[model samples]
Target chain A: MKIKGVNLGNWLVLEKWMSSAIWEGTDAEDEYYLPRGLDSKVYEARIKMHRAEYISERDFARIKAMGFNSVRIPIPYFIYGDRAPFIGCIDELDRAFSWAEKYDLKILIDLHTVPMSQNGFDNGGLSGVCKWAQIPEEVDFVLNLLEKLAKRYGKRKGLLGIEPINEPVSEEMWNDMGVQKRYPPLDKEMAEGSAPISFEWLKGFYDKAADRILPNIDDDKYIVFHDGFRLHAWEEYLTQDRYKGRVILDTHQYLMIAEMLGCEQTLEAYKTFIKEKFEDEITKVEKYVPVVVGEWCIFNSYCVVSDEEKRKVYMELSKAQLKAWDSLSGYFYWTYKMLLDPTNQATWRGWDCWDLAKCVDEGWFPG
Target chain B: MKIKGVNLGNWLVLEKWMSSAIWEGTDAEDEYYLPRGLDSKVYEARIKMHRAEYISERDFARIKAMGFNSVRIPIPYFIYGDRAPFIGCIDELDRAFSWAEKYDLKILIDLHTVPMSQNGFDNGGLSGVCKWAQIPEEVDFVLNLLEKLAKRYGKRKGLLGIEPINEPVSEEMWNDMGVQKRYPPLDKEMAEGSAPISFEWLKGFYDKAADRILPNIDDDKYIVFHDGFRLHAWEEYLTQDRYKGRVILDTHQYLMIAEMLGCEQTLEAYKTFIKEKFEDEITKVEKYVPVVVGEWCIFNSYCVVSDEEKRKVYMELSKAQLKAWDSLSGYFYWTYKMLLDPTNQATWRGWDCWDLAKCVDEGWFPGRVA
Candidate 1:
């Protein structure tokens, strides 16, 4: 697979089924309010699954049009089994795999929402904060889900690989209030540690998951791992001999981290830093495994600091970061669809750092 | 006269006491510990008329060599008097004015410490946390200090201006427990209704102080007002007619806010955001006031993310942001001193973002540090 992709987030999968209602009533408004309630049955039916498939198909076609060859689908453990302990969403999963094959795009199944939730971010879907240490059943559930997913998609042509987990923080920190134990006491050091160390731990967890899951799958199938939190450090795991030939390290790049840190908010600065960090890490990892920027994006025009010059600078910086990381398998710009309503717009507006349709319509996509 | 200056510090007034306490000690380690306690007394001596003169003359010559026309003399409120009911620091403040006249360099006498404490930041030099609102005495004391300061320095040429208070945050937030309110709320708009509406309140406080303090002095001297917590909005007050001509708006720009908010880590994106935000705000406020970027800095390295490329990008972006805002009267790059011990190189090494002597020695003075 010449790695080209986008994340197919079951808008509800990202939010989990804490609420007991579906998001497809009269319009986007009805769906938004239903999710606020913590009802499990609301998500038992994968109504959002179709919407996700629709968006993914549109994005996959777009990616194909843009000359890309892959897609990374974030599949939840709940999708496989709802109220019943081990019942599966194998049929739906098969539908997606077949769809990717039809589109001629390889699919990298990402076990995005773990059993108990690894990081507890809204993207993980389950409610409340992440209680990683206390939740043994959830951890086992995730490992089990990985085993099931690998055995099922093990020999498909459209199947590119599998990512054990996406952006897992330290299991130690996960158990202990998620406060990262790192440098600078209370400064930039605190924030930087959030990404890099988490990436390292995620790789270790992937190895553990691989020991159990990889053998069940065909030998030809590859394994993909997320770069914890820091996109720059993907090379560290990819270059390991254990990862050699059959591994691809996936990473996410974002603009918010840089902007908040008081760094120059321009594409040139973005490109320079991304290039330097990526090159340093990649050179050391390339001998062992390949790399892929699984998630990357720029905000839309509705951004608060609405300076056209800065917007152009953001696009140029993104382009440079992508182009410089050419050794990777390919790139997946985050987000294919968003709930387009006034309140949703306001909520997503300031943080709309990832919206591909907007990016394409705005002429920011590759020529 | 140009602003030629250096801190008098403990080198002079507390010299005898510090030397006696340390040298008479049994060991070198003991001597080091002894001096730390004595230094506070030495700083206190800054209020004495004779000591102020001696320190001012020496500092003036150095300032002149450095091509500066003014010296910012920091004075504590305790210098005025032992009594707390009224403006106490008036006498020592008068002594500072006299020395400014003799040295020919204008004096910017900043009220370094307040009665109850303002924000309790490290620079504020108070215990616990700074409760800016709870202590009415402190607020009254600050107003009294301002009145006294304005009355005494209002006529002196070397007495250029007064800084209201340093890094003021929410008085209510600092004292209230279980409150989510903190400095730099996610939204700037939320800060106004719930927090301090303007530094103008401090300005108004000063005006009321002036009613009692300024009538005794001349009106030609400049009254400098820091932008309180909202550093970017200094331009807002600058454009208002009431403060025009006589006031200078102070802005303290730091990279920490940008870094935390993920805005300044990437150079190009950060620069674009800063330039737009800054230019928009400045354009709106420049019509009425003269702006002064009081404190701003760029570190050559950040320990957490040791990406030299990121640091380089920050420097470049910061330069562009500074360049975009031409209305700035002048900028005082963060510091002239390092708090860490010089020999302990690694930890202390990165702390010095602005050391004029080091910059000059390396010949990267204005080019790099600027």
Candidate 2:
């Protein structure tokens, strides 16, 4: 299927920036600290409340109505509750399946966070930590979780595939993306113990994770691998001969980071980078495995000061980005919702780029 | 005074592009052909009707509310109705003085259109015809008209100055500004006979015109000379020794034309041109005489396709242009009004940069980009 999708982000996943209400009682920046800081009753109640209310059955209908056929649900490692100090969201995923099937939407189960944190982003359940690959037992725990997810949802009508991990940061990406600077962990040792994931370790993990998860699912089901911010490095890996057309290579493209890498804010500049960088990279990699832009957003570094101007600039940006992404198997917008009210001028105005629904409502995206 | 003004354009001067109704019932392109093509009764009635209503008393009040203290009135050479086939707006101008005095507004009487054409623009009463300088008698007639305007409005408290002639085309400006290509006059012989004004002739005209008009007006009254698109050409021509602070050099700077000269459509790019070209030019020339940006607008070559985007872009453009013009004696936005409804999407929606009132209502300018 041409996977037109939107990520059900900040629903199961707790990103403080996206949902300030989740971390309301405390100053936690990630899922780990969020639960640890709040009382047991409050944390449990909030988690259950957030899951039920953040994204409802009607949201799937909304996405479907907005011309999307699929959604990539980002689930934390504690989704089964087997991991301590964190709650399981297995029930929410179960309900997501029920809603997706009813609404005729495909589901891509993305393991967004790992035991130790895969990319150090707050969305990864922890910040300033990337030691998931370095610890052997922790790696085994993540693989088992993936296998459990595959076996559980393998036969569901809504299941499209399973994404093994999300945004594994490489050494180059760690420095360039300002990961540590943006989100510093509370645990000093975790920050010090962590290191960027090497290609050898990432490739070996992808191999084992796929092998364990692929057989649990049906023959039509696929195992997807994120590019770890090194899209071109996966050329020799994930060959059709190895997976037999049952695997997809996923990458995320965002212009906010592109601006950090020196791309201009003009529509012409954004389009040029999309053709030369995104389209060219996807074209080369798709020959071996079906390539999908797993996550991209309409954010930019235009330094726009007015709401009207932001809408104008972001609409042009979204149009250019969507046109370039048409060459891929399909792409999913980075997010479906955010807790911050887009119309709240003091805090969230001019920053609705990440809110896919708001983007549609404001005409920042094509309806 | 740091003058903040708007032009009473298309009121006395009939530019069809600004007021399309004036050229209604005919395909005439310029003022010359406009009256020539219409019936005598219709022409007289319409001219009287347009002058009376196009800019009403309320418009002066609106401009005053917008925080403008002065107005540059672009009156035609036939404003006195001395020329045939064309009605004189002398009565309308009399009403303007009464209104200006009432509103506490300063008036700079700009002789916008001369006997052939000054810059061969539609606003210059004719297009593709720049031969007014070639005919000495026509030149004398224009000089006499300037003297008459000074004699008429010299004693009025609202009088700021008299602009001798608006936008006389120097040879360089004629080629650079694309004057002929924008508005081609219908008369083939007139177009061929037309020639660009030489600096020697322009300087001589300014010299005699100032002497004749400056004396008719009070000593406090000044004479404004257009740059002829060569802003620096008068550095040696108009000096402290020549006029002794009774002269002001006027130049128009618009991003629409800057884009024609290859300025990129970015706020940064526009601001850079303002500093490097506009501000620098004004600074250098103001050393010779006080400088005012007589006519500039928010139009750009950004090729904006949406109304919202146009507002955003034009607001930024107006802010930057206003900032650059801060060092000048003052500035007057291109026109206070236009016949075309700015809200009409099919034709004139993205083109309201010339309408000062619309620009203010739309937040395209600061409560002043003051």
Candidate 3:
């Protein structure tokens, strides 16, 4: 299926309910509060049982209208509760699946956040910085959550695949596998070993999640795995024949991560970098399984900057980079909506609009 | 003197001591004992004593070797301690001034944090997200701090300028000024006539600071001000005749804020967006005063995807943008050192080593340094 989609922000991730401490209604000093009583009730109701999910429908429809055929829906792990140890909000998960069916959009159930803050971002739910090892219960809870989700969503249509976790940035997962080891505070053992410490941990988790979850499912659903945010080592994970054909490797591409951190060069140089680094990763991974450039976007805009000539230069350079990476299963731009309306003059923060996706729409899937 | 710099990570702003309640400290969990002692001591040693200031001497020395000769140092209001109702750490300010003299590097004393958090970033040294107007003490404290710093650093040779505040991401600054805004907890009053809040709040601080501080100083020191991170409005602030020669408009350029929040195009489109924005803003501001792309860097390298190809791309794009901003005096890349070393593969975050300065030395400055 041709990949196409937009993220459901503030709902599964980034929203006050998911990221803010006030979701539990604990601290008065918690800055972000969901109003009180009735208003709060209405907020929760809108998220769990209303047309809120239809936003995804609209996005999918938008993609379809633009002549695309797929949508990747990022879901939080709380959707399935197994026991006291697990706190799954099953109703929310069911509504999501039902919504996808209604829209006739194929879904890639990405477990956007894991329990106990698998990643310390607000998107992961908890606020203060978190190290994954510090929260073992969250790890187990996630594995259980995946098993439960696989068993349930496994048979449904519009279910293209399942991503166990989103952008796992832990040191253990990043270093243990030796995928792209850089930086410090590394574990001594993994640092000395041939493999990266983080990748080893990620592989262990992936294998366990797959072993337990995949067996419980009857449908031929492809299991989607992320190459721990530290490195896009999908090639390493997919090389093992045990996971042939049944798996699809997911990679997130953001210029801020891929190009911004490497060198100082011209737009031509950046395009070459995209071709080599990104294309190479895709080429290597496609040999073993299907590859998806799951998340990718160009964040800067000419609108904020007053100079038209400079704006044209930046926009053209950005277009060139996106055009270079237009291959692969497809790409999903980072977001859909933000604090400001697109038409509004005050929308200055990056990745806060749909225009980026719209820019590449014509070049995306030309038959 | 050209602007040369590196961030003095955790200095002046004294919130970490007060908010130790949030951090899971390795050895101690007692908020009363740990925060007061550890936070205050670190403030004195690292921030107040300007430990970074000393390290910055080494950095400036190295920067000088590379043909650069200035530094932009960010300070918090708590260092002055008057307007915000919180106790000021005057002793620390004195230490910073002494350190600036010792280093021989020109200083751009930036008021990094305000009374209420101007930006939600931890670097602001305030609790909670950036809530500007909610805390009125911030306004007064900022004015007071500026007065103190402008007076103190005014005549010093290494004291190149003063930046009023860093990245004003608060709704009050964004909404009140009729500029674009990000983050949450929107203000209703900002929608009404409360719209277009004056930079007078900021300028008043600068004027008072300059009057009290500038007259006593001997050298020609300029007043550098940021375009408030929400929008690059240097032209708006620099247009006042009083600001003409005395002001240098400061703007921050970051791919995440620019691309992630603004254009949301492909990496290529994003680059174009940045280039255009920089060119336009520079042209507009250059008409009034010297413009500087004060802060920016390609920060994607610290992550796991440190592919040489991607790194080169980022470098090329960044250099292109920097080169495109021709009207600007110079650009100061965002950082100097990572918490971890870059070469020691074991010590790096896939994302931490995104410093362009490192890339340049590694023979990776994409495109000739035009």
Candidate 4:
């Protein structure tokens, strides 16, 4: 039942950091950049080629060769035709279903971005806005969107699970210095002179998501809810009688974030950090329902060894991490591939490092 | 010229760890085991088979493809008929010469192991004895062996340099001068038989070696000498006043040695240790003579991060070391290929970590990210 997989980020949903080509001249770098960056005609036209080339039958076979059984694809809620400009990924999702079935892979349909932006981060289609949950009409649109997606291919053989949303703006992310630097102050988070989101409001969304999505899909398909950055807070909420065995919680653990938060600076500190921060925290929810580490990667600050006795020791440490991940239900690497090939020495260092396929092929993967 | 190459270990000489078949039954194969048998007629056939199969023209072509311009082949003392039962490697060296010339690569002839075991290890063709320099005849034999090798390939266009010895003993090795570079006391056993070779004798041997070798090889050809495992002590010994550009000081840098020596357990401390201990030590030697890190790899102790962060960060640390190595003449990674099948998943720790060609193929090389 363990599904080893990867998130096809920047595929159907546009993330500028992964592929900057699509947002070449944008002032603000988000899905909202379409209006300011280019004509809707131009934006939609570019997306056609971008979507076709990004993930293909070649990538499906590539991940399959790497032993991945499932792929969690992030799609925008606007794909349901909810007044969002860039549309037509529904046909693309159909292609994915055919390719997934062709390659014997499962799919976890993740609604990554909402119309007004769920998390306010760039990944959510807006740079800094978290008003999606506050607007009653927006909430209705999201539920209706989920229901529509469920009514289509919920019972398909490739359908493993459906995530209600990707990353929603948690109160912590709103106040994070790194996030704050980009978006400045929280407009809606403190719009009424107080934070807009709460565990109660988050629970209402999950409850409504389950209510709207569960009946449309078969009883077997899992209803996945994200941890909303407070992974520990939702343990009690998901264990309630209505959601007990039917829902799964997803959390993301990245060393880059841990480093930004000043987690630790030594090899010894990370040993304890993985346990307390990831294993210990996630296991608290494991007893209630299955949990998956939706995203993570091997990123950090500067280290000081070359390709000698020093680098191999780090490889040994990576083996230890693969051993540590045995604690979770399953974990998916942050991505499968990127526009930049890690082997392409012609490009800068940023894009290639984001590639999971190159990392795995290069013997960096645990598998 | 800068020499970027690989140490061809366990190719000409048989080591137990690398190929256990040679010594599986007999303590006789031990460096101290003096001709206990003609040493594996079956084992010799295996040795012959290994010699044939271990490295071929294909391998030379492979390293050449990965941007390596030279190869340092570690040969046993007996290859030139200095001893019996191991006289056949001379033929293998001939094969290497033909391949090197064919593949567009230079060769660094390293007198890697000696009769009484240079550092009292198996790598010296004898384990548990550093008596090679002590014996007058044995020292003479080494000098004669160098003369024979120099006569054969010293002036060849493909010869980069000739390393007189690999990991020979020295008093400074046991001295453990720097606090950060101290050897850990955990290995109570590896310390016993590993008494370093005498500095006076090593110095005499080097002078005699250069006396005999210089007459044969070209003036541009180098006389590379190992740091006797005490890299910092050689700064004054190989000064511009004497050896100058003609001599090359070789240092072997490894992290496992640092961890065994009780270096601090933090990334910041390692940064300082590499600076003060390795880069600083080599830079001091560089002031007077050419220096090449003849043997090194990216091995280290457990870091404080999860393995996820640990391996990638090690890649970062590797880039720093490569940047540091850039200031010197060059570095020949300890080895090219350990086990023949680097991609074979069945072999545990299969020695791929030491293989520069495979590591680069795996994107673990510093140049990949750098």
Q: Please, what is the whole-model Cα lDDT of each candidate in the order they appear?
A: 0.50, 0.79, 0.52, 0.68
Model 1 chain B: ten consecutive residues of lowest lDDT? B11-20
Instruction: Give the DockQ-based CAPRI class for model 2.
Output: incorrect
Cα TM-score per model: 0.41, 0.50, 0.41, 0.49
lDDT of 4 by residue, A285-361 (tens): 77767888888765544332453433343444355555556766777778875654222223434234345765543
Q: Write the per-residue lDDT of candidate 3 for residues B293-361, one digit (tens) a residue.
A: 777766542224445666566666666666655556766665543322222223443444344334444
Give the DockQ (C-alpha) for candidate 2: 0.01
lDDT by residue for model 1 over A1-367, one digit each (tens)? 5565666654324432211123333222222223343233333222432232233222443455545567677776666646333224555567566556755777778877655445645565433334442456766777777887777778888778888887675544354443333111122332232322344445566777887666866666788777665445555555667656777777666555465455565555655656666545654454446667787766523244544664565567557756755766676767654433212224443343354543543335443
- Where does candidate 3 stray beyond 4 Å? A15-56, A81-93, A131-136, A170-197, A217-220, A230-236, A262-266, A301-322, A341-367, B1-370
lDDT of 4 by residue, B1-370 (tens): 5667788877886565554434444555443352454333334434543565466554665566556778899888878653655645887788787778856789889888786656655556665555666668878888888998888988787888788888876665434442112322223453344456777778888889988888888887888888877666776678745466688888888755666767776666666777777787678778767788888876675532663565564665566667667788888886776543222223533244565654553445643321
lDDT of 1 at B128: 33
Error of 2 at A355 (Å): 47
Per-residue accuracy of model 2 over B1-370 as CA lDDT, tens digit each: 4888999988888877775555666878888987787667556645654664466544665577567889999998998888999988787788787778866888999999988887898778887888899889999999889888889989899899999989888888788768787888787776886789988989999988987788899988889999887887787878747587788888987767677778877778878887888887688877767899999988766744665776677787787777778787898889887744432234764565677765665556654422
Assign candidate 1 its CAPRI class.
Answer: incorrect
lDDT of 3 at B168: 60
Worst 10 residues of 4 chain A by lDDT: A341-350
Predicted structure 2, TM vs. truth? 0.50
Q: Is candidate 1 or candidate 4 better by TM-score?
A: 4
Q: Which candidate has the highest TM-score of all?
A: 2
True contacts kept of 3: 0.00
